Ligand binder design. Structure first.
Ligand code: HEM
Ligand SMILES: C=C1CC[C@H](O)C/C1=C\C=C1\CCC[C@]2(C)[C@@H]([C@H](C)CCCC(C)C)CC[C@@H]12
Length: 464
């Protein structure tokens, strides 16, 4: 069983993570330098194993894919979803059924259709128009980016987009997003260690359970509004398709599709899309205002390939290596999902001599892969040029894994990439981005299951 740093009795390394000035993924990378690529932590009595660097992360999630495909049975995840749904589903027939349905649905109701790309572009127009509203005055992009990004998924799930005046839906996403953040909280690591803490009426765990209630109700209401006009066997979207599957499993009682599992799946798909993609864009914008020379080079490429008023296109990607370079270097350098989503072993495992008992939490420290000095030159530097080959084309790197690897890898990778590219290009084509009174902006990320920047104002002035 892998060695690791010691911590106090009862609470273990929750203390050492807690009392460290460094964020958890940074903490963990330093400890691998002392204990090895694979080390352990005692998180209040839950034994967890951390994987660090590209080699062991691959060795587990890819070479032993079925053994590390599971999710851990932490009290919070048992309470929230009973380990059904998709994202936190146990590895099994339930997960196979939901994953398959989701993959096919995103293909069929999404990027598999010729008209889909223009629906993204339609959204960049609402988005850019909303930006113009402010007439170059400083504001926070967080809301608009969130609205716009979530609508690309709303099309696939609910068959429609919600307007930017829809503050009810926005409120539901703000609570759900708070929950993704509180999930990384010391309060929650303790709650999972000591679930009797649930008797305590105050604290971040009660905020999370309350939020989850409000969110669960809202999602079931949306799912009901989206199933009104349903024509059995002729689905308009993911919700209809899910209901199709419940029909075909009415006689199969071991069928895993359920009304509860539909709310969990929809919630998981919606929050997975909105949290992550939004943040990528928010980091990118931050860095383009910080480094105008880099912003300007992207803009130069846009004008050469797309012109001043051309509609951006997914097909343009491969004529725009520098743009693709910047975007990949944001994924690598900001690590929007720094520790991925926790895994667990689906059976007793043996990795590099160490034994890992069935059910152990396994943390894949994706941050440490992107800063693995065996595969990256000076990874502590933001430098898009590292993704360019000697002819100036985009050069893909094996050790860039911001959508993780193996059986559980991001289901939305492709969709995210189109969203990112089309939103970033549409925005930079129309605007110049800089800070107010050249304010000194903060680049220290906010502690959560995803990394987002602190609130920052930005000025968007039209270019032509
Ligand atoms: C920049 C955008 C995104 C990033 C960086 C990202 C990252 C990730 C990561 C690191 C995982 C962990 C997989 C694991 O357990 O090892 C994941 C899983 C997942 N992602 Fe994404 N994601 C993004 C966008 C999306 C979008 C747009 C969707 C859906 C529309 C999505 C849906 C999911 C789902 C459902 C899972 C769980 C898959 C499973 O458990 O089988 N993600 N994502
Ligand atoms: C769906 C439903 C159904 C609706 C309920 O309110 C609860 C719920 C999800 C709850 C959570 C809270 C805990 C943290 C979870 C389990 C997130 C998980 C830690 C992954 C977050 C990282 C991801 C955005 C990359 C995803 C869903 C989150």
């Amino acid at each position: 069983f892998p060695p690791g740093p010691p911590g106090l009795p009862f609470i273990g390394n929750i203390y050492s993570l807690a009392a460290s000035s460094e964020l958890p993924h940074v903490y963990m990378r330093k400890q691998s330098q002392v204990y090895g690529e694979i080390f352990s932590l005692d998180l209040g009595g839950i034994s967890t194993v951390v994987l660090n660097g590209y080699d062991v992360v691959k060795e587990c999630l890819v070479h032993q894919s079925e053994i590390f495909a599971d999710r851990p049975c932490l009290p919070l995840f048992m309470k929230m979803t009973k380990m059904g749904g998709l994202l936190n589903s146990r590895y099994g027939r339930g997960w196979v059924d939901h994953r398959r349905l989701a993959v096919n649905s995103f293909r069929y109701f999404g990027y598999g259709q010729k008209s889909f790309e223009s629906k993204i572009l339609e959204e960049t127009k609402f988005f850019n128009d909303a930006i113009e509203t402010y007439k170059g005055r400083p504001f926070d992009f967080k809301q608009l980016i969130t609205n716009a990004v979530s609508n690309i998924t709303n099309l696939i799930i609910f068959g429609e987009r919600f307007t930017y005046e829809d503050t009810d839906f926005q409120h539901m996403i703000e609570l759900f997003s708070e929950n993704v953040e509180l999930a990384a909280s010391a309060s929650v690591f303790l709650y999972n260690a000591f679930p009797w803490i649930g008797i305590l009426p105050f604290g971040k765990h009660q905020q999370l359970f309350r939020n989850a209630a409000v969110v669960y109700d809202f999602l079931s209401r949306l799912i009901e509004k989206a199933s009104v006009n349903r024509k059995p066997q002729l689905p308009q979207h993911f919700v209809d398709a899910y209901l199709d599957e419940m029909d075909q499993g009415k006689n199969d009682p071991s069928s895993t599709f359920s009304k509860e599992n539909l709310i969990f799946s929809v919630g998981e798909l919606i929050i997975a899309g909105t949290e992550t993609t939004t943040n990528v864009l928010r980091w990118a914008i931050l860095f383009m205002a910080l480094y105008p020379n880099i912003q300007g080079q992207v803009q130069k490429e846009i004008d050469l390939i797309m012109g001043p008023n051309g509609k951006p296109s997914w097909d343009d990607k491969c004529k725009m290596p520098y743009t693709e370079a910047v975007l990949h270097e944001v994924l690598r350098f900001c690590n929007i999902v720094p520790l991925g989503i926790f895994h667990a072993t689906s059976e007793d495992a043996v990795v590099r001599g160490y034994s890992i008992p069935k059910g152990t939490t396994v943390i894949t420290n994706l941050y440490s892969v992107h800063f693995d000095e065996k595969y990256w030159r000076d990874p502590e530097v933001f430098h898009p040029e590292r993704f360019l080959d000697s002819s100036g084309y985009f050069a893909k790197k094996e050790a860039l894994v911001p959508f993780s690897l193996g059986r559980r890898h991001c289901l939305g990778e492709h969709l995210a990439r189109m969203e990112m590219f089309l939103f970033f290009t549409a925005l930079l084509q129309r605007f110049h981005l800089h800070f107010p009174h050249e304010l000194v902006p903060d680049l220290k990320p906010r502690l959560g299951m995803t990394l987002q920047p602190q609130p920052y104002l930005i000025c968007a002035e039209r270019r032509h």
